[PDB]
Amino acid sequence: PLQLAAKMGKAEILKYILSREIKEKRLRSLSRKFTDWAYGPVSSSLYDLTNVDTTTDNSVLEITVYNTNIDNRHEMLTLEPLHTLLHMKWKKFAKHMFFLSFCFYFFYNITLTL
């Protein structure tokens, strides 16, 4: 149902499930977001990444990005775990890979022209 919400374009249901925090202690394993600590107006929350990170075949991030038969694709990537995950991926390995691809294609075009 989480992957179905990602595929069908339901941004509100996906926003609820991804950031689902349950206050009561009788069933807290059903939560996906856990507040590690909150000191004043500063709180650190832990977001579960079971089927969200692109490491479990069909994941929420891959379904949200790669699929095309939706109109609200832009607003679904603005959620808390997906945005942050894309940021860290870009700042970890995607930046160097894109720069290397740019440099190799630029040199290939330059030497082909020459």
Closest approach of Cβ 67 to a copy of itself, in Å?
A: 11
Q: What share of the chain is helix, strand, coil (3-state, %, to 5)?
A: 55, 10, 35
Choice between 1 and 114, CB closer to a copy of itself: 114
Choice between 30 and 114, CB closer to ligand POV: 114
Distance (Å, whole) CA 37 – CA 39: 7
Question: Mask: binding to ligand POV, 64-103, rule CB under 6 A, as x and -?
Answer: -----------------------------x-xxxxxxxx-
CA 65 to chain centre: 9
Query: Which three-class secondary structure state does DSSP give residue 49?
Result: coil
Distance (Å, whole) CA 100 – CA 22: 44
Choice between 4 and 97, CB closer to ligand POV: 97
Binding site for ligand POV (CB under 6 A): 93, 95-102, 106, 113
